[PDB]
Paper text:
To better understand the difference in ubiquitination efficiency between hMiro1 and hMiro2, we first determined the crystal structures of the isolated cGTPase domains of both proteins to high resolution (hMiro1-C: 2.25 Å; hMiro2-C: 1.69 Å). Unexpectedly, both domains crystallized as symmetric dimers. The dimer interface is a highly conserved hydrophobic surface along one face of the cGTPase domain, which, in the intact hMiro1-BC structure, forms the interface with the second hidden EF hand (hEF2). The cGTPase does not mediate dimerization in the context of the full-length molecule, as the hEF2/cGTPase interface is mutually exclusive with cGTPase dimerization, and hMiro1-BC is purely monomeric even at high concentrations. Interestingly, although the same conserved residues mediate dimerization in hMiro1-C and hMiro2-C, their dimer relationships differ significantly. We performed size exclusion chromatography with in-line multi-angle light scattering (SEC-MALS) and confirmed that both hMiro1-C and hMiro2-C dimerize in solution. Subsequently, we successfully disrupted dimerization of hMiro1-C in solution by introducing three mutations at the hydrophobic interface (V418R, Y470S, L472A), thereby generating a stable hMiro1 cGTPase monomer (hMiro1-CM). We note that the two lysines in addition to K572 identified as ubiquitinated by mass spectrometry of the hMiro1-CD, K454 and K512, can be mapped in the dimer, but not the monomer, to roughly the same continuous surface containing K572.
Numbering used by the authors: 415 to 442, 455 to 463, 468 to 560, 565 to 579
Write the structure that this text describes.
């Protein structure tokens, strides 16, 4: 019965990934850990690159992070999902980051809400560093399945 869970935080460069790790540590290093309700959630900051290694794919739960101010950020999340996680035993969560900024329409063929519903993912979770613990509990909860 594991109580320590690993989560890969994946998204476009400067989409607010490091903010998510710092938020878990309680703020407004590419790994961050803290207790979640007692469970331990270990986040991994996966920098944007050309491809992902099989060491960056394995985890207990995936946190796909896209930027609501960057219309090109969700396409990356959707592409990575279908390539590495759509055909996997790994639960996935999509987070609409920088929520406090204005939501410009994402340039993808499918809406985020539709895309999530299409692949049995929870609806897109809004998040900002300006911090709630909601996503980390859900990430941990989804890891406990
Ligand atoms: N408005 C807003 N800006 C943010 C938030 N989180 C991060 N940023 C800004 O986004 C920029 C890049 O974020 P960063 O953490 O470096 O993302 P990363 O490069 O993917 O790790 C930073 O200069 C932050 O000021 C947020 O929740 N709200």
């Amino acid at each position: 019965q594991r109580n320590v869970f690993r989560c890969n935080v994946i998204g476009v460069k400067n989409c607010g990934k490091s903010g998510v790790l710092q938020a878990l540590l309680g703020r407004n290093s590419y790994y961050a850990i803290n207790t979640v309700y007692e469970k331990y959630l270990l986040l991994h900051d996966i920098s944007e690159s050309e491809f992902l290694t099989e060491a960056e794919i394995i985890c207990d739960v995936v946190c796909l992070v896209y930027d609501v101010s960057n219309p090109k950020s969700f396409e990356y999340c959707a592409r990575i999902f279908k390539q590495h996680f759509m055909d996997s035993r790994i639960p996935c969560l999509i987070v609409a980051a920088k929520s406090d900024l204005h939501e410009v329409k994402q340039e993808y063929s499918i809406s985020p809400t539709d895309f999530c519903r299409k692949h049995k993912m929870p609806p897109p979770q809004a998040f900002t560093c300006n911090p709630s613990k909601d996503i980390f509990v859900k990430l941990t909860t989804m890891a406990m399945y």
